[PDB]
Paper text:
Ras protein is a small GTPase involved in central regulatory processes such as cell differentiation, proliferation and apoptosis. It possesses multiple conformational states and acts as a molecular switch between an active, GTP-bound state, and an inactive, GDP-bound state, controlling essential signal transduction pathways. Two segments of Ras termed switch I and switch II correspond to the regions that exhibit large conformational changes upon transition from the GTP- to the GDP-bound state. Ras structure consists of a central β-sheet core (β1–β6) surrounded by a bundle of 5 α-helices (α1–α5).
Therefore, the negatively charged Asp was replaced by the positively charged residue Lys. Thus Ras(D33K) is a mutant that is predominantly in the effector binding state 2(T), in contrast to the wild-type protein. The crystal structure of Ras(D33K) in complex with Mg2+.GppNHp is almost identical to our Ras(wt) structure with a r.m.s.d. of the Cα atoms of 0.13 Å and similar average B-factors, which is not surprising since the equilibrium between state 1(T) and state 2(T) in solution is abolished within the crystal. The substitution of Asp 33 by a lysine does not induce significant structural modifications except a new hydrogen-bond between Lys 33 and Glu 31. Contrary to the Ras(wt)·Mg2+·GppNHp behaviour, the mutant Ras(D33K)·Mg2+·GppNHp shows a very low population of state 1(T) in solution, according to its 31P NMR spectrum. In our structures of Ras(wt) and Ras(D33K) at ambient pressure, Gln 61 is oriented toward the nucleotide while this residue is usually oriented toward a symmetric molecule in the crystalline packing. Interestingly, a molecule of PEG is clearly visible in the electron density map of the Ras(wt) and Ras(D33K) structures whatever the pressure, between the switch II, the α3 helix and the α3* helix from a symmetric molecule (ESI Fig. S8†).
Numbering used by the authors: 1 to 166
The structure:
């Protein structure tokens, strides 16, 4: 079957692992547990296609850029994740996208902007500003919560569908 190599990137503590785990194990992880690198494999049916999701979950920590580059290099799509109550994580998005384009040699790579933690009242980044940024990249913007499961399958399946059209 078709395999889609999906890579999850973004600043530390935005919820990259929580989204992945919610998708793979149907539970919300509430623990403090920084990732170095983890990979997940899951067989799914998306729009009737049987495929395999290889999901690489990456570190948010700066010490790990080298490892992050090696892994970004083999991905066919990227979930660029920020948290809606962390404005610095939103600002850091431009820095992650530029690095993706530099390691992939490409202006236009299959990619989804994910605004996560949308279950929280204390929102510092407005959906408007995120939606604007996503428009200026030419990518979809999806709001998610790993806690409620809102938007989770959407964010992942949308990225698969972007790869299929690339
Ligand atoms: N309320 C809420 N909390 C979340 C959500 N997603 C993640 N978190 C919480 O935020 C913290 C960090 O989440 P985690 O998945 O570890 O983040 P990460 O992006 O993988 N961090 P790292 O870059 O270190 O691997 C955890 O306490 C987790 O439960 C969400 O959608 N809502
Ligand atoms: Mg993590």
């Amino acid at each position: 079957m078709t395999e889609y190599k999906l890579v999850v990137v973004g600043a530390g503590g935005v919820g990259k692992s929580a989204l992945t785990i919610q998708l793979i194990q149907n539970h919300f992880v509430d623990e403090y547990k920084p990732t170095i690198e983890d990979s997940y494999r899951k067989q799914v049916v998306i729009d009737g296609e049987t495929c395999l999701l290889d999901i690489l979950d990456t570190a948010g920590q700066e010490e790990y850029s080298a490892m992050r580059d090696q892994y970004m290099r083999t991905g066919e799509g990227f979930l660029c994740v920020f948290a809606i109550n962390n404005t610095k994580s939103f600002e850091d998005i431009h820095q992650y996208r530029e690095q993706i384009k530099r390691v992939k040699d490409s202006d236009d790579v299959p990619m989804v902007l994910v605004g996560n933690k949308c279950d929280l009242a204390a929102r510092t980044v407005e959906s408007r500003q995120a939606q604007d940024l996503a428009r200026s990249y030419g990518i979809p913007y999806i709001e998610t919560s790993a806690k409620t499961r809102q938007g989770v399958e959407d964010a992942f399946y949308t990225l698969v569908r972007e790869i299929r059209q690339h």
